[PDB]
Amino acid sequence: FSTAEAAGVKVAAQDGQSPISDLSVVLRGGSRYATVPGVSHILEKFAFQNTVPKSALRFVRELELFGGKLYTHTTREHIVLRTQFLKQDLPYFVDAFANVLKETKFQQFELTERVAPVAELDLLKRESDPAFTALEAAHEVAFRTGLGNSVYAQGYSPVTLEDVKEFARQVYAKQNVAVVGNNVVPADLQQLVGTAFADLQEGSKVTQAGTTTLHGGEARVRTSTGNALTIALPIAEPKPVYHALASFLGGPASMPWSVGASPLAQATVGTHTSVKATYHNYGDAGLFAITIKGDSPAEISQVAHKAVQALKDTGAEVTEEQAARAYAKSKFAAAEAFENPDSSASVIGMELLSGVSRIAPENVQKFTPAELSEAAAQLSASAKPVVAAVGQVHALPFADEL
């Protein structure tokens, strides 16, 4: 991805050999920047509504003539708006993104009838998975605000049209916009972005109101629709070793109808439970999480004990074999993330909008058994462990039990 600049907008493109181009606008407008709770989810869902040049309806009917597709999502860091189309139709898509950023009519009826209902269905679909709820709850405990803000709009805290219009006034600005083109000729994109995004405000860099503070604790989301438990450990200094540790501890199986050879996978034997270690770098803090879902609260509890033991055991000693297995699993994970268009866009988006140069999958560091065990030891000896339980919360573990 050749990084350049066109009329104050950072543009990154990589030409390829396919008939399919993906153009993604990455906005510095994720939930950690949200002025009011849920506004970044709402702004994402307000993309490709009525603009002054072109109605939502006309856009959709024309996008069907090109056979393009539209994908949007909100993270804690970004809003990503992606379009997938045939190579030749690039000018249309550039101009459509320009209309969205310059000329969205944020009309109250769109919010009431179109945007808000869809944002609510989006959330209900995600929450069908109790593990999603558990990991969301864990971020809320760990960070409180900023990273602790909910990503998604909730019913209890309503976003108004003034809220969304204000946030968009900050976000839709040259300083907060990056364009990423997969299988787009880089010289052609610079020319088009340079003409289309010339009239966009400059604005200023959107910032997190307040510094990231870490806290420990418990969250107990009582649902009737499945059981899960996250054990998170807030990290004050995000380091690349936690990727290797997440992949080492593992949890998912690498083979059908198997349990797996990872420590966390081996913790689930004899139970219909699944487990997954994940590490989330957010630049200035991180979260290392182990999430366990299952149907039985008794089995979840049983696994959760084994899971914390596994982390402590890792803090003791890692073998050379296990350290190499971690390097392999981690290189692979980095590669497939850079391939998946959703994650790809946000990776280069971070590079463009911040200045965190992307780590190529071929440059993923090999961590020795010493470095891995040291990282696991710091986690086992954290002053601020977080636990989010979801489901039959009366029967799930507590932080002081673990």
């Binding site: 009917r61 003539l65 997938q84 690498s254 083979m255 109808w257 198997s258 392999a328 290189k331």
Partner: protein, 438 residues
């Protein structure tokens, strides 16, 4: 313009097909087999699915545990699925982990233990799978749909097989199945992503050279299905959403009408209330359904097999007092493919498909699945230029002619699941397959 799909054979008759992409760092190699549940009889129905479980239960060299470790150490993953007509076993890995993955695949396919102890263990696992598919409503609906459309025929059997068979599958019949079916002339070794074709051909000569050939080598994608218009109702008043499928007999992979059926399907298209754009879609049925809140979703499908297909729509709705309207409106939109469609709808649908067929291929596993599917159903990979020409040849006249012979006044297979009290009886549904005004 995508890189060329290279294709080679071995001596035994194994096809090797590859499409390299120097932009990615991962590779998907795997084996596509022209064999699946359809190859069983009634006594060993469930064998193919049973084997898929045992393939990962240990080989003559590596034990179950060694297998697990070997794959974990590769870094990537292995995956498998058995359908009615097709079995796949693939391995996604890193670029330089391709020789390991080919070796593991060749091992689990040719040299599996199938130990009585593991047969006995999986026999419970698979028994439990019978009582948990129950939750996957779409799958429940489509499995009953095949059962009824192809009543007492091979395509009508499920993949899991009956409970009774699961209890009586022996290692002998497992062995017999994979010896008769997993032959070189029925198999394609596929690589997509960061693979060299010539490297993959060498790996095939190293691992898959001692594969048995079948006595009578037919071409890839070689097959008599007699559709039964019929209905299955699984009423469940406790469910909040009704799931309904309606299908007619569709087209096979090699039908002359294959593209005509795709264009017809695209005229009705899909709808989902949870997607933002769906309220704006051009499809007439989409507009009727969205304006009236008749459904949560619908998905048109055109499923093909070697000698038949099912073409139809799958609907989900919470509007339980207006199911009659939902079905009424849907069938009347089908009627118009026979009576009313013009260049307006046909050209719109063609435009949407010309991109759609190419868009779908957006990662190495999708590319591999495309190469594998096409090679095992058509015997060749169809280039985008040929596909563009086949689509361009579809006219409004072709769509009308096809609909009048396939849809108009034809028997349907109908499956309803959930609160379907308001779905009328077979006759009134089937009467909507024609228009008295035409």
């Amino acid at each position: 313009v995508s890189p060329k799909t290279r294709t080679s054979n071995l001596k035994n008759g194994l096809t090797i097909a590859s499409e390299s992409n120097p932009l990615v760092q991962t590779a998907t190699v795997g084996v596509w087999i022209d064999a699946g549940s359809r190859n069983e009889n009634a006594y060993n129905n469930g064998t193919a699915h049973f084997f898929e479980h045992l393939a990962f239960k240990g080989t003559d060299k590596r034990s179950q545990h060694q297998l697990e470790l070997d794959i974990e150490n590769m870094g990537g993953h292995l995956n498998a699925y058995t359908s009615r007509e097709s079995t796949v076993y693939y391995a996604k890995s890193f670029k330089d982990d391709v020789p390991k993955s080919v070796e593991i695949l060749a091992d689990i396919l040719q040299h599996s233990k199938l130990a009585e102890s593991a047969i006995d263990r999986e026999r419970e696992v698979i028994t439990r799978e019978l009582e948990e598919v129950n939750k996957q409503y779409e799958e429940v609906v489509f499995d009953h749909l095949h059962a009824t459309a192809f009543m007492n025929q091979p395509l009508g059997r499920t993949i899991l097989g009956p409970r009774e068979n699961i209890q009586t599958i022996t290692n002998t019949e497992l062995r017999k199945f994979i010896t008769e079916n997993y032959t070189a002339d029925r198999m394609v070794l596929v690589g997509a992503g960061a693979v060299d074709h010539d490297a993959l051909v060498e790996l095939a000569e190293k691992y898959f050279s001692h594969l048995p050939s079948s006595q009578s080598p037919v071409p890839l994608g070689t097959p008599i299905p007699n559709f039964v218009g019929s209905e299955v109702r699984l009423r469940d008043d406790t469910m909040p959403v009704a799931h309904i499928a309606i299908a007619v007999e569709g087209v096979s992979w090699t039908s002359e009408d294959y593209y005509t059926a795709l264009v017809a399907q695209a005229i009705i298209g899909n709808y989902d209330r949870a997607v933002g754009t769906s309220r704006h879609q051009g499809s007439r049925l989409s507009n009727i359904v969205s304006e009236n809140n008749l459904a949560n979703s619908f998905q048109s499908f055109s499923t093909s097999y070697s000698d038949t297909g099912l073409w139809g729509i799958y609907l989900t709705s919470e509007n339980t007092t207006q199911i009659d309207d939902l079905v009424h409106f849907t069938l009347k939109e089908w009627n118009r493919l026979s009576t009313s469609v013009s260049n307006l709808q046909v050209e719109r649908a063609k435009s949407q498909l010309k991109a759609g067929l190419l868009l779908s291929l957006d990662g190495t596993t999708y590319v591999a699945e495309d190469i594998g599917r096409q090679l095992t159903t058509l015997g060749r990979r169809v280039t985008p230029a040929e596909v563009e020409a086949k689509l361009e040849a579809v006219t409004e006249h072709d769509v009308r002619a096809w609909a009048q012979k396939t849809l108009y006044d034809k028997d349907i297979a109908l499956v309803g699941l959930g609160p379907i009290e308001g779905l009328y009886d077979y006759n009134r549904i089937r009467n909507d397959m024609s228009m008295m005004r035409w």
